[PDB]
């Protein structure tokens, strides 16, 4: 599924991500924009052999199981395929764990490089939320 901007904002709010760990909804929408361009089916292989999955490009190195990432963990206790669903619940649940791990949203390199410090409220501007 490819979400619209406000549509994704609403879905994230519905699943309790707005101001989770102090990160406003615009931060989460911005991260999703630059991680996946709002596409739930996005997958990208990393140089180390792990793969990133879904709207928030969650890595099989630590967070989900894809059966082909040696030495990795599965801390969200989910198959990585679950992070590709049209329903964003599994991605949201796992993102909540990731952002609680110590470094906040810096865990998402695209958030640090493209969202952090910017006018992230622009991402929810005009949205009926
Ligand atoms: Cl957009
Ligand atoms: Cl915001
Ligand atoms: Cl594996
Ligand atoms: Cl980046
Ligand atoms: Na894994």
From Swiss-Prot:
EC number: 3.2.1.17
Catalytic activity: Hydrolysis of (1->4)-beta-linkages between N-acetylmuramic acid and N-acetyl-D-glucosamine residues in a peptidoglycan and between N-acetyl-D-glucosamine residues in chitodextrins
Domain C-type lysozyme: 1-129
Annotated binding of substrate, by residue: 101
Any GO BP: defense response to bacterium
Top-level lineage group: Eukaryota
Keywords: Allergen, Antimicrobial, Bacteriolytic enzyme, Disulfide bond, Glycosidase, Hydrolase, Secreted, Signal
Pfam family, one: Lys
UniProt tissue specificity: In the egg white and polymorphonuclear leukocytes.
Main localization of the protein described in the UniProt heading: secreted
Function: Lysozymes have primarily a bacteriolytic function; those in tissues and body fluids are associated with the monocyte-macrophage system and enhance the activity of immunoagents. Has bacteriolytic activity against M.luteus.
Family to which the UniProt record says this protein belongs: Belongs to the glycosyl hydrolase 22 family.
Other known facts: Lysozyme C is capable of both hydrolysis and transglycosylation; it also shows a slight esterase activity. It acts rapidly on both peptide-substituted and unsubstituted peptidoglycan, and slowly on chitin oligosaccharides.
Name under which the protein is recorded: Lysozyme C
Organism: Gallus gallus (Chicken)
